[PDB]
Amino acid sequence: RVFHQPESLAQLEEVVREANAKKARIRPVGSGLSSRAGMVNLALMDRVLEVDKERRTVRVEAGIRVQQLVDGIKEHGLTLQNFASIREQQIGGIVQVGAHGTGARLPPIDEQVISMKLVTPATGTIEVSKEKDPELFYLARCGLGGLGVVAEVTLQCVDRQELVEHTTVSTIQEIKKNHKKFLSENKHVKYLYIPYTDTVVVVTCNPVSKWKGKYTADEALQHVRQLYQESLQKYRPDVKSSNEDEPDINELSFTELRDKLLALDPLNKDHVIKVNQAEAEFWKKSEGYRVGWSDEILGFDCGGQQWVSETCYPAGTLSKPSMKDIEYIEELKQLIEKEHIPAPAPIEQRWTARSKSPMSPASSPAEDDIFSWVGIIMYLPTGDARQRKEITEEFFHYRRMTQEWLWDRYSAYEHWAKIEVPKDNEELAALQARLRKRFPVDAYNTARRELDPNKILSNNKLDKLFP
């Protein structure tokens, strides 16, 4: 068991060079897709190197966390273009898996990278950009951590702006009439779908005007707090001798209440339907506006454990949306109800512009191509490993239904951070051929063999995805 924690680029280079001579194996921690290999952690390479206010760019070591980056460039009037799930991830790993936010004209995070430093086992450290080995630059931007350890990145930033977040409820039929307007006139937009109900939550975010500038929160949580009591008295009849066998349920957020509610019987579709109908009623009483800075409006703060499958599929152009992003959801909600899947809320739908990284699920040679990202979810309660196993079993069946009935039809490919390798060799061979028809696997494996001949930077997952 060897552990490495280099504090600088020079120490990381020494680690990789030392492991290449001994032909040993190293495993970067948070640098790509998730043993005898030595662990190399980049958490100490976390400093902002350069901040160009005039070009609105920042150069950072790749081990820095998103929140640390935002707080660093905040003093210079700059912020990040988009934010993915969790500000707790290192920037190098976020880019290497092609993470994304939402916004039909905003591209994924890997497209925000102007250049980077690649520490390769064979050729040392190389600097790549659109003018320095651009073929390798675009391949390695969303390189899944296989072409080398990303040590530094230069990011294109934008001005720090206050944003207005608007939350409304609607329906699929009303959304289909305003979809083209919704995607084109809003900087950020996402739809939150609630299985077994017709309620759709629409969230938009736009910069505040530098000129211009219903139900109480307790009123909206009332029916959720009492449905929990009716469930806490129905499923566990030997509990709730008072409200004192559990901390005060008031001052719990809706997200924490939903987690408590589902945990009482998460695999019963009848109970999940009741929870989802309570959620739809909560959002109906939660329309309104919020104002914050882009990082605190688009960032996510302390959720929980959950299974998520997110896929990326083309949705046409802003000038001519194919409307297949909505039709995918219509068929998905149909499958859930046909198969009685106990699917909780929300099914999250987001959009991005294209990426020029060929390994990105949103890659396209057409600059105006837009992509829809849809995530299905099931929540995992902390506690009994037995119930966590049965929820996991139900989730992989839930995921497999979308995979076998939807993905090939909509040209959908899974987010690299969420991709799961199948155990059956029949499904595994099909996945390898499918990825080979969408991404340049041959060019990818060729660069891997050249930059790492001794296979020091190799995962079981990468070797299974791209044989």
Side-chain angles (χ1 to χ4, degrees), residues 360-376:
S360 167
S363 60
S364 171
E367 62 170 339
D368 53 2
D369 273 352
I370 65 173
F371 290 82
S372 182
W373 302 71
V374 170
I376 64 173

Side-chain angles (χ1 to χ4, degrees), residues 57-73:
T57 72
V58 66
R59 177 186 285 215
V60 294
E61 298 176 320
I64 191 177
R65 289 188 278 98
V66 161
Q67 187 59 65
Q68 263 48 49
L69 203 164
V70 174
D71 286 356
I73 66 180

Side-chain angles (χ1 to χ4, degrees), residues 168-226:
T168 51
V169 294
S170 180
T171 172
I172 289 181
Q173 264 52 232
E174 190 181 63
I175 278 183
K176 275 144 65 177
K177 293 194 308 178
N178 306 277
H179 189 48
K180 170 141 65 182
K181 186 196 74 173
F182 264 146
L183 296 186
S184 299
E185 295 183 356
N186 293 277
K187 185 178 188 175
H188 306 278
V189 56
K190 59 182 180 184
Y191 300 163
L192 303 184
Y193 300 89
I194 304 165
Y196 297 96
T197 78
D198 293 310
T199 309
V200 184
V201 186
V202 179
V203 188
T204 64
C205 305
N206 293 285
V208 308
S209 172
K210 286 134 180 278
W211 314 71
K212 173 202 179 305
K214 173 114 193 176
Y215 306 94
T216 80
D218 307 75
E219 197 171 7
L221 289 170
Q222 176 206 286
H223 68 287
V224 186
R225 288 166 176 170
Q226 62 184 80

